[PDB]
Ligand binder design. Structure first.
Ligand SMILES: [Zn+2]
Ligand SMILES: [Zn+2]
Ligand SMILES: [Zn+2]
Ligand SMILES: [Zn+2]
Ligand SMILES: [Zn+2]
Ligand SMILES: [Zn+2]
Ligand SMILES: [Zn+2]
Lengths: 79, 75, 75, 73, 79, 71
């Protein structure tokens, strides 16, 4: 039941590559017992509206690595 | 052992918060308590303000690393 | 829309520039190249100081017409 | 799709906006519309006040991604 | 005649510290007689998180032989 | 610039309990940077005095600063 943090190749690159994603930090990928991988990340975006637009794309990036449960914290640009 | 019961009540209590799910509070490390949650809100208006309040709630419970995913109905 | 190699690297390399995003370079009819970017600095004062350097970076690539949105850590 | 001419009028019409130039609206592939503009105000303080309104003006025209260069007197 | 250096990976290692939300304005200077000093701005969730991560950051610098640092903390929240 | 007057003005700022490790550097292309460690009551006081400190430096033409608070 004790989770172990793994390091998926290219994941952060693909995330940084998503249109609308201005920066990525605090990416964590965990192996829960019984094969279930989850991930969290903080993502910088222009504003709340842009986040709504890119949330799906981000989730797809994770889904491409077989990851179905994510928690993404958006942080927003500050003029 | 945390006080998850009280924590989730206070989180549900924050103005702008319509619903809270996928709350996880971890202290797996030799130390450092982390928390994640998903939070439903009507729309992005005052999101900055509601994010801050949520973060405060966690801080008041000694939780200082958090990742909060908002889900918005509208806007 | 073009892709100028090294441009974003050179921009990120300018002293006082904390971050660059949303860089876009356009070719208007077969001649006039325009560029737009968001640029993070410490604060408004730092931005004023580095604006000329940033403009030079663009100028070194033949770009004379820019639209720059400054974003700030502080102030 | 949109109307640049009406858009610029609405932008110039925002209280505190002293001048709008270099307004461009781009259609990127896959439906994504971007807009850039230079906008003059009296000073930084006035700009902060009108920034939100400007963003709304763009939003009202279905434009979600903007780059705005403020200029001052 | 002091000069800026670029220690490889340093900003990566700093950004990699758990609880670091952002690093900017990193400067590493070579002072005469071999003495390397460093400055940085480091963003954290709040004061409490910063106290926890300050030691780790100091270690990161120490691993590169750097003993004298001036680190400006920036917080998402005061509290 | 004048380090001596600068340090006086900094020590003079309300909330600043002590100042050490003040350095002012000239980077190429005219850009002056300054760093300092400052003793202050607590995080809240620091937020209040950060702006004042920044102003003090700005008054001397210094636009980029790194200030390390010690509480
Ligand atoms: Zn959810
Ligand atoms: Zn931006
Ligand atoms: Zn202009
Ligand atoms: Zn973050
Ligand atoms: Zn900073
Ligand atoms: Zn040592
Ligand atoms: Zn000290």
């Amino acid at each position: 039941t004790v989770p172990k943090q793994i390091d998926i190749r290219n994941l952060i690159k693909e995330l940084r590559n998503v249109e609308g994603v201005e920066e990525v930090h605090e990416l964590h990928v965990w192996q829960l017992a019984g094969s279930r991988i989850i991930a969290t990340a903080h993502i910088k975006c222009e504003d709340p509206t842009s986040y709504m637009e890119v949330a799906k794309t981000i989730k797809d990036v994770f889904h491409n690595h077989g990851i179905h449960a994510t928690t993404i914290q958006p942080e927003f640009a500050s003029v």
